């Protein structure tokens, strides 16, 4: 009987109850007034008429290759354009943060406690008649049925943007430093207390773990040689807890920063490349500074690789996803005269939307073999057999699957995609349309509008009845794609504002950090400002193989 | 060894070592260039010709009362002047933070680890030949020697600005939520992980402790009634940990946020006052929101009390130090069109500079009683015998001591003063003049200029030999005060920027937090926006006694 269950307040205003059956919207700063904040101020009307849509802005950025080439080669214009991509999205995220799984009103508990993931929209209250609020049946549809009807794979669908296994395993590698759900406490809690890109997946969370993995000479990380080739050290040597099953022998239990990376050989491939990069950067700084000791050689090297990570994510990874002919840029200076809060907190909804399991193929194709999931998982024997070089050639070739578009989730991993739906409801996620309004988008008026077709749309109607009851995770994996694109509209417009805050809100982008002495001089600063996915591979893998986040 | 020991790089330039005996300065965004960042850019010269000194500004806000009398009453103007006091300060503090006691270069470990206090200037390196880097003798003067000669009180010196014991105990009480040193680890570490105004001294550091302190009905805090007067609850009842000497009987072991507050009866005064307040705010919030439950009551009250703390801090407490005829405002909307980061980290030098033990009188005077240190400390029966009303009346009347100007630390607490000296040296603090430069003040050119007299200057020159080797903390309590003022130049110009960062950087002062609905309605917002020390006492002390931070 909470009178805010129906989400009455609009355009980002806030609902407060003023009696057992009465509510009241606080419209402050929202550019609208009236009972439910639906009447615009004069200025706000003009702003709306002149502002374009996400789908129109997408057209321009993905057409006119000749105009964008002129723009891409004038340094001054390129910067101005990129500034606009950055600034036009900051307002979409709340920072300092606000809600979480247990708090639908701003509290000190919801602000102070770094073990929760924060939330873009608050959770439906426990005393609301229906799960979404006051719309829909008493219980949501069966998740197993949604899994089977519109998510699972029949015939493999490839990414028409030509993504590959270098890209998928890099997605999985990067993200698994900040997305680390503490399943003991629940779906809405986290073990990455750094909230953002601290490279804990190489160096460890605690100080205790960090020291076990360090050599204490020349700033380096422990390692071992097998087959005349540098690999991570063992568990028997170092004492770092890893999640292996007991039938793995001692000499194959590798130790790295992220306790879970032993369970896939693609994770452990990047694992070894990033480790090699650290020790390579140690050698560079050592020559520049023979006066430096072990700690400063280490602590500076970590700063450089946080620089490299962010650089590649913006100019190779997000560049590849985007589709754009415009060349994106990592250059923190664009924000020094703007209103940016250098800070971040991981949103539950960012974790949920990044479950891109439809990328994974039915088999894994290295050299002359086709490995199955049961053969691939837990099996580092494969790595040593083939070597880093063969892995890179082979995974640059193999094509990954389409995320949006529906019905392309691998059966090996059906359990996982079902968990995504169940844990959403358990965390009390508001509906798709309330989430699209939250990020300034037009609500879908039908299931056919969502999927751009008739078969899955017809299924989804029968199961949900009202389009305003449709859920976020499933909608993302079924949404109509952009032309020859990997993703739909909702994925990108929610995904991007979350991502940019965790990349640019890193303290090394802050004015007082972003200067050459921070990283050991000009020589260091240049590693960050010329890093790429192709050089990361070439510097650290025998014979310097060609690579890319797309098939050729 | 280290070729940056002599502190070459001026104007905030950062020193780096490019080999065993050769350095380099990073002048990025300083305004200067050249080997040591000393050659000014054109606009920098121009700005230094127009900027007035801090003493010029001080004189202007403390004269012209007929002109400030009009400004105050015309709200348009008032706001423009506050916005000047707020923004003129901001360039001084590093936010995100940078250094700490172990790291004199920037590092993930220094940024990431919330257990340290931060550092405004970096530590002096270990392998430097002297304590201040290169200047002075092998070792500093004997701290006993320093303490006895210029710091200890001979005869009591009253504060010319009329500061009383209400102000003494508000200072101690208020700041002991974020100055909470971890003496097992060492002086550069903290137990206060909110690095700010979270009010852990009323509610607790951990969710564990807070729950033990709460009533779980109407959002209230637990309490007991002794002779018709409401006091905090026992340790028996709560199970919360406090620090009492063995002889204290079960019924006088009170339970409060900060575990150390039982030791001093003046602290217990304010802890009982704010507890009565919290519960008072709950009763109001229930007449308004009879729908609400226990969590939402407790949590909105705790948000409201934070705002009252900040309100009273700026418009009574800091207003009283200032001596200004102009009336300060607490208004978060003044920073909504400025660049300002909404975060903070407490800094060692803030901790050190706020050891204002010269405030303490020779005895604590209540009704017709003059209690000694020995009698006053650890003895809460004194508070139960006289009662809140009479504690307030007595403390509104009793003048506290002058801090600056020398020779006013009372003997009882001399070991504290010495420790302040010795711990600074332990934490490798730099010189006084290195700190004055850092906050854009003029370095002192002699001990006589610093003190404004002859006798202490001669004894200090005899000990230190060179003005450039003088230490920060003893300097603060020796400094020539402003005309009839409690402090001098240095204390304020370092103090104010650190503090405004802790007041205004509070998450409750951002755009998304600062609006009626965060505080449960317009009623709740009114309780912050008309808060004062006078009303805090009036509503929570029997007979609404008159109070103030200065003797009539
Ligand atoms: C063979 C490779 C993979 C396997 C075996 C796998 C399987 C799993 C499993 C079992 C979970 C735990 C879910 C739960 O218990 O509820 C998980 C989490 C997750 N996966 Fe994968 N997945 C793989 C590849 C990927 C890829 C390519 C991505 C794309 C970036 C991805 C994204 C995620 C995300 C975001 C989570 C949640 C992380 C967290 O909250 O802790 N996964 N995966
Ligand atoms: C009148 C009774 C007081 C006594 C007996 C006293 C004595 C002491 C002692 C023994 C310590 C170190 C041990 C501890 O943490 O308990 C200390 C530290 C300190 N004192 Fe006091 N003091 C008194 C009042 C004040 C006042 C009026 C102020 C004014 C602001 C003040 C400011 C501080 C500060 C900021 C610290 C450092 C605390 C920390 O870092 O944890 N004290 N004092
Ligand atoms: C961030 O929020 C979390 C959720 O509130 C806190 O984690 C919770 O800490 C509680 C104790 O401080 C646990 O409460 C349980 O309480 C009973 C009653 O006293 C105890 O017997 C139980 O042992 C205790 N724990 C368990 C596991 O039963 C909560 O369980 C615990 N976690 C969860 C998921 O609820 C964090 O402490 C908080 N952060 C901070 C700094 O306080
Ligand atoms: C933030 O900073 C603090 C300083 O680095 C950390 O506190 C230190 O944690 C260490 C744990 O790794 C303690 O180590 C002691 O010393 C040896 C070193 O080899 C260990 O084996 C011992 O087990 C350990 N204990 C004893 C009794 O020797 C440090 O002593 C400890 N304290 C201090 C004052 O330095 C914090 O851990 C750190 N937090 C994080 C998250 O990084
Ligand atoms: C808007 C634009 C340029 C297309 C864009 C696309 C992005 C990202 C950022 C931007 Cl600005 C970051 C992404 C990530 O971090 O994975 C992904 C995202 F789908 F959002 F998840 O693609
Ligand atoms: C510049 C002006 C207005 C005089 C000023 C004075 C202050 C403070 C803030 C300002 Cl803006 C805060 C203070 C504190 O927190 O105790 C003290 C300080 F001495 F600085 F420590 O007095
Ligand atoms: C009450 C604390 C003083 C006892 C310790 C002896 C310190 C001696 O110090 C002397 O004190 C004289 C009298 O105040 C001053 O005139 C001298 O300048 C000073 O050197
Ligand atoms: C693991 O990989 C090895 C090496 O190719 C292979 O022979 C073996 O069958 C795999 N083991 C399992 C349990 O699948
Ligand atoms: C504390 O003061 C009271 C008077 O209020 C006195 O009776 C008592 O002796 C003192 N207590 C102790 C433990 O010294
Ligand atoms: C808000 O709009 C109007 C009042 O202007 C009212 O008819 C409507 O019922 C209000 N809110 C909802 C959720 O219907
Ligand atoms: C910096 O100042 C000048 C260079 O202009 C040089 O003579 C001097 O020795 C340098 N170092 C120091 C410590 O002043």
Distances (CA, A) of A168 to A300, A403, A479, A535, B347: 29, 11, 20, 18, 43
B13-22 in b/e form (b: 16+ CB < 10 A) is: bbbbbeeeee
CB B168 within 8 A of CB B143: no
- Positive or negative, the CA dihedral B327, B332, B338, B343 is positive
Query: In a 3-state reduction of DSSP, which class is residue B542?
Result: coil
CB B325 within 8 A of CB B69: yes
Q: Which residues contact B343 (CB under 8 A, 6 or more apart)?
A: A96, A341, A343, B95, B96, B505
How many other CB atoms are there within 10 angstroms of residue B217's CB atom? 12
CB B543 within 8 A of CB B233: no
How many other CB atoms are there within 10 angstroms of residue A436's CB atom? 19
Closest alpha carbon to B463 in B139, B128, B152: B139
Q: Which residues contact B381 (CB under 8 A, 6 or more apart)?
A: B252
How many other CB atoms are there within 10 angstroms of residue A551's CB atom? 18
- The H or E element containing residue B39 is strand B39-40
Question: Residue B40: phi, psi to the nearest 5?
Answer: -80, 150
Distances (CA, A) of A52 to A48, A56, A479, B352: 8, 7, 21, 55
Overall residue count recorded for chain B in this entry: 552
Q: What is the DSSP string of B125-178?
A: PTTSSBTTBSSS-SSPPPHHHHIIIIIB-SS--B-TT-BBHHHHHHHHHHHTTT
Nearest-CA residue of chain B relative to A2?
A: B291
Write the burial class of residue B128 (CB in 10 Å: 0-12 exposed, 13-18 middle, 19+ buried). middle
Q: Which residues contact B530 (CB under 8 A, 6 or more apart)?
A: none
How many other CB atoms are there within 10 angstroms of residue B81's CB atom? 18
Query: In a 3-state reduction of DSSP, which class is residue A134?
Result: coil
What CA–CA distance (Å, rounded) separates A120 from B468?
53
CB A156 within 8 A of CB A147: no
Instruction: List, chain by chain if needed, residues with CB within 6 Å of any ligand 11 atom.
Output: B 6, 8, 35-36
CA–chain centroid gap for A72, Å, is: 26
What CA–CA distance (Å, rounded) separates A45 from A32?
10
Name the closest-CA residue to atom 11, ligand 8.
Answer: A375
Closest alpha carbon to A476 in A491, A463, A486, A493: A491
Query: In a 3-state reduction of DSSP, which class is residue A144?
Result: helix
Alpha helices in B234-370 (DSSP H): 235-238, 265-288, 294-312, 319-322, 348-353
What CA–CA distance (Å, rounded) separates A228 from A241?
26
CB contact under 8 A, A18 and B94: no
What CA–CA distance (Å, rounded) separates B380 from B264?
8
Give the ligand with the smallest distance to the CA of A384.
8
Closest alpha carbon to B292 in B515, B518, B520: B520
A172-196 in b/e form (b: 16+ CB < 10 A) is: bbbbbbbbbbeeeeebbbbbbebbb
Residue B378 backbone zone (phi > 0: left; psi -120 to 50: alpha; other: beta) = left
> Considering all CA atoms of chain A, what is the largest pairwise distance in Å, rounded to the nearest integer?
74
CB A464 within 8 A of CB A141: yes
Alpha helices in A51-102 (DSSP H): 54-61, 65-73, 75-90
Is B354 one of the annotated active-site residues of the chain? Answer: yes
Catalytic choice (B176, B195, B201, B278)? B176
How many other CB atoms are there within 10 angstroms of residue B50's CB atom? 6
What CA–CA distance (Å, rounded) separates A91 from A101?
22
Using a CB-CB cut-off of 8 Å, the residues of chain B touching A16 are 517, 520-521
Which A residues 194-233 touch B at CB under 8 Å? 194, 198, 207
Q: How was this structure determined?
A: X-ray
Closest alpha carbon to A404 in A347, A355, A477: A477
Instruction: List, chain by chain if needed, residues with CB within 6 Å of any ligand 1 atom.
Output: A 168, 171-172, 175, 179-181, 264, 351, 354-357, 359-360, 413, 416, 419
What CA–CA distance (Å, rounded) separates B149 from B417?
13
Give the 3-state DSSP-derived string for A223-267, with helices as H, strands as E and coil as C: CEEECCEEECCEHHHHCCCCCCCCCCCHHHCECCCCCCHHHCHHH
Q: Which residues contact A32 (CB under 8 A, 6 or more apart)?
A: A10, A11, A13, A38, A39, A40, A41, A44
- The H or E element containing residue B230 is strand B229-231
- The H or E element containing residue A523 is helix A522-530
Residue B225, beta-bridge partner list: B230
How many other CB atoms are there within 10 angstroms of residue B166's CB atom? 27
CB A496 within 8 A of CB A453: no
What CA–CA distance (Å, rounded) separates A27 from B516?
10
> What dihedral angle (degrees, nearest 10) is formed by the CA atoms of B279, B285, B289, B291?
-20
Q: What is the DSSP string of A322-348?
A: H--SS-----GGGGTTS--------BH
In the block, residue with structure tokens 């802005």: A57
Question: Residue A120: phi, psi to the nearest 5?
Answer: -60, -50
Q: What is the DSSP string of A275-307?
A: HHHHHHHHHHHHHH-TT--HHHHHHHHHHHHHH
What CA–CA distance (Å, rounded) separates B156 from A267?
70
Name the DSSP class of A518. G
CB A38 within 8 A of CB A10: yes
In the block, residue with structure tokens 């770094």: A114
Query: In a 3-state reduction of DSSP, which class is residue B438?
Result: helix
Distances (CA, A) of B188 to A471, B269, B350: 50, 30, 12
Pick among A4, A12, A105 to test the B interface (most B CBs inside 10 A): A105
Q: What is the DSSP string of A8-31?
A: ---TT-EEEEEETTEEEEE-TTSS
Name the DSSP class of B214. B
Query: In a 3-state reduction of DSSP, which class is residue A445?
Result: coil
What CA–CA distance (Å, rounded) separates A403 from A163?
11
Q: Which residues contact A370 (CB under 8 A, 6 or more apart)?
A: A363, A364
* B449-452 CB contacts, 8 Å cutoff, 24+ apart: B450/B475, B450/B478, B450/B479, B450/B480, B451/B406, B451/B478, B451/B479, B451/B480, B452/B480, B452/B481
β B23-26/B14-17 pair status: antiparallel
CB B205 within 8 A of CB B259: no
How many other CB atoms are there within 10 angstroms of residue A154's CB atom? 8
Residue A87 tokens read as 């600034």
Alpha helices in A354-413 (DSSP H): 373-376, 381-397
What CA–CA distance (Å, rounded) separates B299 from A108?
7
Closest alpha carbon to B302 in B323, B330, B318, B281: B281
β A39-40/A32-33 pair status: antiparallel
Query: In a 3-state reduction of DSSP, which class is residue B221?
Result: strand
What CA–CA distance (Å, rounded) separates A437 from B137?
69
Distance to chain A for B194, nearest Cα, Å = 8
**HSE-CB for B316 with a 13 A CA cutoff:** 22
CB A19 within 8 A of CB A2: no
What CA–CA distance (Å, rounded) separates B291 from A443?
32
> Considering all CA atoms of chain B, what is the largest pairwise distance in Å, rounded to the nearest integer?
74
- Positive or negative, the CA dihedral B286, B291, B295, B300 is negative
CA–chain centroid gap for A326, Å, is: 22
- Peptide bond before A96: cis, by omega within 30 degrees of 0? yes
Q: Choose the closest CB to A515 out of B26, B103, B290.
A: B26
Question: Residue A15: phi, psi to the nearest 5?
Answer: -90, 120
B246-277 in b/e form (b: 16+ CB < 10 A) is: eebeeebbbbbbbbebbbbbbbbbbbbbbbbb
Question: Residue A139: phi, psi to the nearest 5?
Answer: -125, 145
Resolution, angstroms, 1 dp: 2.8
Distances (CA, A) of A406 to A285, A411, A458, A516, B101: 49, 14, 13, 47, 55
Q: Which residues contact A50 (CB under 8 A, 6 or more apart)?
A: none
CB A170 within 8 A of CB A264: no
> Is residue B357 annotated as involved in ligand binding?
yes
What CA–CA distance (Å, rounded) separates A425 from A7?
17
How many other CB atoms are there within 10 angstroms of residue B82's CB atom? 18
**HSE-CB for B179 with a 13 A CA cutoff:** 17
Name the closest-CA residue to atom 29, ligand 3.
Answer: A185
CB contact under 8 A, B516 and A26: yes
Residue B273 tokens read as 């006052």
- The H or E element containing residue B26 is strand B23-26
Distances (CA, A) of A292 to A520, B193, B462: 10, 32, 38
Query: Could you tell me how many CB contacts below 8 A there are between chain A and chain B?
Result: 122
Closest alpha carbon to B500 in B95, B12, B58, B48: B95
CB A534 within 8 A of CB B52: no
Distances (CA, A) of B444 to B179, B467, B468, B490: 29, 7, 8, 11
- Structural Rg of chain B based on CA atoms: 24
Catalytic choice (B33, B244, B317, B354)? B354
CA–chain centroid gap for A45, Å, is: 34
What CA–CA distance (Å, rounded) separates B162 from B10?
40
Closest alpha carbon to B406 in B154, B158, B150, B145: B150
CB B215 within 8 A of CB B222: yes
Q: Which residues contact B532 (CB under 8 A, 6 or more apart)?
A: B311, B312, B315, B316
A464-490 in b/e form (b: 16+ CB < 10 A) is: beebbbbbbbbbbbbbbbbeebbbbbb
Q: Ligand 10 centre from A131 Cα, in Å?
A: 22
Nearest-CA residue of chain A relative to B306?
A: A108
- The H or E element containing residue A32 is strand A32-33
Residue B391 tokens read as 């504690």
What CA–CA distance (Å, rounded) separates B58 from B46?
22
- Domains in chain B (CATH in brackets) are 1-41 (2.10.25.10), 42-552 (1.10.640.10)
Apex A345 CA angle, A341 and A346, nearest 5: 140
Question: Residue B271: phi, psi to the nearest 5?
Answer: -65, -35
Residue A116, beta-bridge partner list: A189
CB contact under 8 A, B111 and A507: yes
How many other CB atoms are there within 10 angstroms of residue A411's CB atom? 11
β B369-371/B364-366 pair status: antiparallel
Tell whether A293 lies on the interface with B, counting CB pairs under 8 A. no
Residue A389 CB–ligand 10 contact under 6 Å: no
Closest alpha carbon to B310 in B198, B406, B420, B226: B198
Residue A307 tokens read as 């620089």
Name the closest-CA residue to atom 32, ligand 3.
Answer: A185
**HSE-CB for B153 with a 13 A CA cutoff:** 22
Closest alpha carbon to B508 in A14, A108, A113, A93: A108
How many other CB atoms are there within 10 angstroms of residue A454's CB atom? 10
CB B204 within 8 A of CB B255: no
How many other CB atoms are there within 10 angstroms of residue A134's CB atom? 11
CB A320 within 8 A of CB A168: no
**HSE-CB for A530 with a 13 A CA cutoff:** 8
Give the 3-state DSSP-derived string for B373-430, with helices as H, strands as E and coil as C: HHHHCCCCHHHHHHHHHHHHHHHHHCECECCCCCCCECHHHHHHHHHHHHHHHHCCCC
- The H or E element containing residue B112 is helix B108-112
């Amino acid at each position: 009987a909470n009178p805010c269950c129906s989400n009455p307040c609009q355009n980002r205003g806030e609902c407060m109850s003023t009696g057992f059956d009465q509510y009241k919207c606080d419209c402050t700063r929202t550019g609208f007034y009236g009972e439910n904040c639906t009447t615009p101020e004069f200025l706000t009307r003009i702003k709306l008429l002149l502002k374009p849509t996400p789908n129109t802005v997408h057209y321009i950025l993905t057409h006119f290759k000749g105009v964008w080439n002129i723009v891409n080669n004038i340094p001054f214009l390129r910067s101005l354009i990129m500034k606009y991509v950055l600034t036009s999205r900051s307002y979409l995220i709340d920072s300092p943060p606000t809600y979480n799984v247990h708090y639908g009103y701003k509290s000190w508990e919801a602000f102070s406690n770094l073990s929760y993931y924060t939330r873009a929209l608050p959770p439906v209250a426990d005393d609301c008649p229906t799960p979404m609020g006051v719309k829909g049946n008493k219980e949501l549809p069966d998740s197993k049925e949604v899994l089977e009807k519109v998510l699972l794979r029949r015939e493999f669908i490839p990414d028409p943007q030509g993504s590959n296994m270098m890209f998928a395993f890099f997605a999985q590698h990067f993200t698994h430093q900040f997305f680390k759900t503490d399943h003991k406490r629940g779906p809405g809690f986290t073990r990455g207390l750094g909230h953002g890109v601290d490279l804990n997946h190489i160096y460890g969370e605690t100080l205790d773990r960090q020291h076990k993995l360090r050599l204490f000479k020349d700033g380096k990380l422990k390692y071992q040689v097998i087959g005349g080739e540098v690999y991570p050290p063992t568990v028997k040597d170092t004492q770092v807890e890893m999640i292996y099953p007991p039938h793995i022998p001692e000499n194959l239990q590798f130790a790295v920063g992220q306790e879970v990376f032993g369970l896939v050989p693609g994770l452990m491939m990047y694992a070894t490349i990033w480790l090699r990069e650290h020790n390579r950067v140690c050698d560079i700084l050592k020559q520049e500074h023979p006066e430096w000791g072990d700690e400063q050689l280490f602590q500076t090297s970590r700063l450089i690789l946080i620089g490299e990570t962010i650089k590649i994510v913006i100019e190779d990874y997000v560049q590849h996803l985007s589709g754009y002919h415009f060349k994106l840029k990592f250059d923190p200076e664009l924000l020094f005269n703007q209103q940016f809060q250098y800070q971040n907190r991981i949103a539950s909804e960012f974790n949920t939307l990044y479950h891109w399991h439809p990328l994974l193929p039915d088999t894994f194709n290295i050299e002359d073999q086709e490995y199955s999931f049961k053969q691939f998982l837990y099996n580092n024997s494969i790595l040593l057999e083939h070597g880093l070089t063969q892995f890179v050639e082979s995974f640059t070739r193999q094509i990954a699957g389409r995320v949006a578009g529906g019905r392309n989730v691998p059966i090996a991993v059906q359990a996982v995609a079902k968990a995504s739906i169940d844990q959403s409801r358990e965390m009390k996620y508001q509906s798709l349309n309330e989430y699209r309004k939250r990020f300034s988008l037009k609500p879908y008026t039908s299931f056919e509008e969502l999927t751009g077709e008739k078969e899955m749309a017809a299924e989804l109607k029968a199961l949900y009845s009202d389009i305003d009851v449709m859920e976020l995770y499933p909608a993302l994996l079924v949404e109509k794609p952009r032309p020859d694109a990997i993703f739909g509209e909702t994925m990108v417009e929610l995904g991007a504002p979350f991502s940019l805050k965790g990349l640019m809100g890193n303290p090394i982008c802050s004015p007082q950090y972003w200067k050459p002495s921070t990283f050991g001089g000009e020589v260091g600063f240049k590693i960050i400002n010329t890093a790429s996915i192709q050089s990361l591979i070439c510097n650290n893998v025998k014979g310097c193989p060609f690579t890319s986040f797309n098939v050729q």
